[PDB]
Design a protein around this ligand. Sequence first.
Ligand SMILES: c1ccc2c(NCCCCCCCNc3c4c(nc5ccccc35)CCCC4)c3c(nc2c1)CCCC3
Ligand SMILES: c1ccc2c(NCCCCCCCNc3c4c(nc5ccccc35)CCCC4)c3c(nc2c1)CCCC3
Ligand SMILES: *[C@@H]1O[C@H](CO)[C@@H](O[C@@H]2O[C@H](CO)[C@@H](O)[C@H](O)[C@H]2NC(C)=O)[C@H](O)[C@H]1NC(C)=O
Ligand SMILES: *[C@@H]1O[C@H](CO)[C@@H](O[C@@H]2O[C@H](CO)[C@@H](O)[C@H](O)[C@H]2NC(C)=O)[C@H](O)[C@H]1NC(C)=O
Ligand SMILES: *[C@@H]1O[C@H](CO)[C@@H](O)[C@H](O)[C@H]1NC(C)=O
Ligand SMILES: *[C@@H]1O[C@H](CO)[C@@H](O)[C@H](O)[C@H]1NC(C)=O
Ligand SMILES: *[C@@H]1O[C@H](CO)[C@@H](O)[C@H](O)[C@H]1NC(C)=O
Ligand SMILES: *[C@@H]1O[C@H](CO)[C@@H](O)[C@H](O)[C@H]1NC(C)=O
Lengths: 534, 534
Amino acid sequence: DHSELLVNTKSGKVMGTRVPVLSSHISAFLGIPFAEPPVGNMRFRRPEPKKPWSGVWNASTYPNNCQQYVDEQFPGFSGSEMWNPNREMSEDCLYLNIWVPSPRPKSTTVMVWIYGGGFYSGSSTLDVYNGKYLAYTEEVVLVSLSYRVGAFGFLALHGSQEAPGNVGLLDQRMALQWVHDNIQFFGGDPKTVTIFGESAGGASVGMHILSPGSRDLFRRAILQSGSPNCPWASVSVAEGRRRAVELGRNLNCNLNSDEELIHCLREKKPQELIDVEWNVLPFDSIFRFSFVPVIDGEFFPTSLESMLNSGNFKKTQILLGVNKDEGSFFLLYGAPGFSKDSESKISREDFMSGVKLSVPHANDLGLDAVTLQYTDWMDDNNGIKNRDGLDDIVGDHNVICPLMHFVNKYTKFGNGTYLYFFNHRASNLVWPEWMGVIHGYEIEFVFGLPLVKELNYTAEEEALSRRIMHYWATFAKTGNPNEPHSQESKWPLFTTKEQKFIDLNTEPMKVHQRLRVQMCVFWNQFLPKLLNAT
Amino acid sequence: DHSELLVNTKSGKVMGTRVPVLSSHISAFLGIPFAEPPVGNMRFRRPEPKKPWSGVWNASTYPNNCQQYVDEQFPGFSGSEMWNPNREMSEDCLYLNIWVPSPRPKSTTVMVWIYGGGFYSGSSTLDVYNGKYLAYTEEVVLVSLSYRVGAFGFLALHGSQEAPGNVGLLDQRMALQWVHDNIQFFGGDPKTVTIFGESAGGASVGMHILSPGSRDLFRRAILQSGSPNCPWASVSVAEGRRRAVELGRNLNCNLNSDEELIHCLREKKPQELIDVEWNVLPFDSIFRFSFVPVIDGEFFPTSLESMLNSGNFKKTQILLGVNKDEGSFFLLYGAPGFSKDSESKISREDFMSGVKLSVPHANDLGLDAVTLQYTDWMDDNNGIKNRDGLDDIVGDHNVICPLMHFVNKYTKFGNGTYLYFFNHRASNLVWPEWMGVIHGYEIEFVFGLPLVKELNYTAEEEALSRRIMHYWATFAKTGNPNEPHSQESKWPLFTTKEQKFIDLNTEPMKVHQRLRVQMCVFWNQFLPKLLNAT
Ligand SMILES: c1ccc2c(NCCCCCCCNc3c4c(nc5ccccc35)CCCC4)c3c(nc2c1)CCCC3
Ligand SMILES: c1ccc2c(NCCCCCCCNc3c4c(nc5ccccc35)CCCC4)c3c(nc2c1)CCCC3
Ligand SMILES: *[C@@H]1O[C@H](CO)[C@@H](O[C@@H]2O[C@H](CO)[C@@H](O)[C@H](O)[C@H]2NC(C)=O)[C@H](O)[C@H]1NC(C)=O
Ligand SMILES: *[C@@H]1O[C@H](CO)[C@@H](O[C@@H]2O[C@H](CO)[C@@H](O)[C@H](O)[C@H]2NC(C)=O)[C@H](O)[C@H]1NC(C)=O
Ligand SMILES: *[C@@H]1O[C@H](CO)[C@@H](O)[C@H](O)[C@H]1NC(C)=O
Ligand SMILES: *[C@@H]1O[C@H](CO)[C@@H](O)[C@H](O)[C@H]1NC(C)=O
Ligand SMILES: *[C@@H]1O[C@H](CO)[C@@H](O)[C@H](O)[C@H]1NC(C)=O
Ligand SMILES: *[C@@H]1O[C@H](CO)[C@@H](O)[C@H](O)[C@H]1NC(C)=O
């Protein structure tokens, strides 16, 4: 061995780079390969482990991002563009990044970040996912992985080994296997790996908790605004096959066999796929994504609900939560009457339109039930109430209530649950006020952006960020976000009986109980019963 | 003619009696016949007009009450016994009573009282229905009528002219015809007759508004805690026939034809019928009564809802309303966990039991919907909340929400609607506090009991009574409860757009809008849709 930036791993040697962070410096190993390029005939296939290399892999720069749909709704607007790929796209995109304190630790807590983006997009290289603040401030080794999205990751033709489904999740698993096998060389402890992620990454985290083939590869878990049972995070194998054939149909493929369909899809340029990906959804919907995880009998041995009910999952500690206005983004992008530069007060007809888009699988009685539950009939033409109503419908149904169902099912068998409600609206938010505390906007706090002066956060936002980062890292280290014997207020354990959680914001800690219970009884128990009966 | 107590009517002469009232005196003509005794072979038959008589009918004393079930739940307790027959019972019971100011007016406003009691009980002669205070204080001629209840009034074998159904309602119509024909001799104006009643009497009032054969016989209407469309106030002709045959079956009757069944029922003593009357209900229920009005194609030409929708009803002014805790009585008598001398905090299981009794025609999804609508899931074991919840369920479903549906349908075609919410709990109430403002407990205020010192009301309750009596009588006189050009606060008109109502209590008037709208959308629109689909 020779110097701090050189690490010899089981796949070969890697040379990283020294990075400044908050007046100090750490090491960064960017763009390390964890799988063979899933290109050509390996499109849609399971990933294969990266063949070891001779020489020194240069890991001074970010890798390519996976091939994906790029948002152009607000060209140049920082609010949207901060989510788009900031590197060239390529199918050659299975890489990971590691930020390591300096001096190199010996055996320290590891955190592995799994990006969101609806299973159709996302990048490990975004500015908001820069691991250097968290690695430096909390003294963790912070890994970000990547995985195939869209059809490249989730095209599913169950029965075929050429496009089985779930390959994106197997990408994530392979990176976790590599971390298990190699992170000791960077000074990480492979026995103390926390996986964490947001939205689709939060669902993904839950999915590794459930999947037998993944559970052993990590210790602990954090789920931010996402749950493995969310209504958008998986499809049946029949629905997967249906969408894959419809994809073929949109590209004039031969549909006579899997073999013909796959061969045709493998010859298309990546953009051809992405150009028609959104055409295969079965309903007029918002918060529904075309190529997502499939309940295949393999990655997931049975239905998610039967797994949760029977305790068929990894038993460990989890820390998880939701933002106050999870719905607002999806409505802005997808529902009539919502706009970025308006207050977006919603008429009764835009309301009813929005209900239908939000619960696309409901029949008419079901839509009446939703409408009744969320309408203030003493004031039914209030545009603000209609707007916020629909924001709650989308948030509750797609994020908060499936998370609460997960949390209640998990807590029965698990070894410690910590639950949060993030309701701080950042002082420098570029999105309009009506959108509130937006899906994804806790991530900048978790990654320490407010510690960076030039980004224009307040001092109280810096404090909030430091507190969150320290909850997250102390939890990853110990299974408990609270500092042993500190003076600070204690985040209590969520238990089956008392169902406690805390808010996360710049005000003194407040403990509450039974997060959105009234609505979640509707979404989790009554409505599914209504739709099954009718 | 000769003196004030002697009146010559079209049926013959009547001698009344002079009655003291509040330091003064008025005349009372008690127990005047309006139909032939509906006895023997006339049991279950339409009423026949009373044959005129020679000589002077002595009308100095109250008539017999109709044959009915007598409440013995709290023997001797004034709260219950004030509702029971206070005269001997007889099938010979079709009489009316008239209270007339002194000196005899010439042509004054007339108010005709139709008692409640679920169509199975009630009496014109109760102390709480004594018309002398209202007649004296407001200078109206106050009539109370009677009508056959239970099977005697409502046994229905559609197709037969021996027991057609609705004969009790035809009793009421015959008394109204007699008033139309004869009240001028008492100094009443037959062109200005208001019919008013409570619970089943309120439903009955609505029924005469709807029925073509009754509409012409009165001018204006007042409905207290009852609506013609209430779920307990009518049955289909198939359900009527079913219950009449089951009545036969309970009495070992021959069931081979209507002719045989009726003949057998006509030989029974009245008590035999009453002893088994409650056995014929199709469900385990509260707020459901065995022999009630039938939707026959004659009294009611079509379904009540089609009548209301098409404007097929008398167009006039109406004044109507509800009490705050309409449910409490039915729960006390009928639901587990409610008792008179306890606070009646209700367990979750007594709650679920009570929901089932309250909505006996719902399937299991429907019961889940009701449960969800009325349960505070942040506090679901609160015994007080469970108690009050069920009190609201019973009240909303059986009284307030059908009244609100009636009020909204009527107001579209009608000529002026005044709506109230009576929420004063009397200072001397003998029932427990949990029961609140009980079904029937506005009646003592409408009839002026609080003006009587010995009855132990407060001075503010006396004021309330006087205000109510004056609303009721000014409305009966003019079609508007408000005094032209007075200084007092104005009860506004309920309109389709603004849906205003007032509270009635001892505090300054408050105007509100959209009475229990949130719950009434559930009962009136969503739940019936849910039960029809499933
Ligand atoms: C986590 C991850 C990402 C986030 C995010 N990204 C921005 C979301 C990008 C919006 C594109 C939707 C159009 N979705 C589409 C797709 C296709 N075709 C389409 C064709 C027509 C219309 C829409 C289409 C094909 C490929 C798949 C997508 C944003 C937010 N939070 C996030 C939190 C908050 C607000 C702004 C955006
Ligand atoms: C308007 C009119 C009457 C009212 C009233 N009357 C008191 C209500 C009497 C309770 C009896 C129910 C049992 N109903 C029953 C019947 C039969 N059999 C039964 C057999 C078993 C059990 C019950 C039975 C046969 C005949 C029909 C009834 C009361 C109130 N408000 C009223 C307002 C308020 C509280 C106290 C009572
Ligand atoms: C998490 O699991 C640990 C250990 O498996 C639990 O700690 C045990 O608690 C039981 C009962 O209180 C004791 O009998 C054991 O001695 C404990 N084990 C150890 C090693 O401490 C702990 O209670 C679990 N935590 C939660 C929140 O369920
Ligand atoms: C009740 O009916 C009366 C009369 O039928 C209504 O008064 C009429 O109002 C219309 C339109 O404002 C006028 O053209 C008539 O001249 C009025 N008639 C009389 C004789 O006054 C009255 O508006 C109705 N009230 C309600 C509340 O609907
Ligand atoms: C590694 O490759 C990157 C690619 O841009 C380059 O910028 C850098 O100079 C290279 N460093 C070394 C040590 O080869
Ligand atoms: C911070 O604020 C300045 C001054 O208004 C502004 O010009 C700049 O764009 C902001 N910087 C960032 C990184 O948002
Ligand atoms: C009328 O009959 C009643 C019946 O009790 C009786 O009390 C009263 O004395 C009679 N009065 C006359 C004038 O006959
Ligand atoms: C009125 O109050 C008195 C004194 O306590 C009581 O004894 C009496 O029963 C009450 N009277 C009535 C009519 O309720």
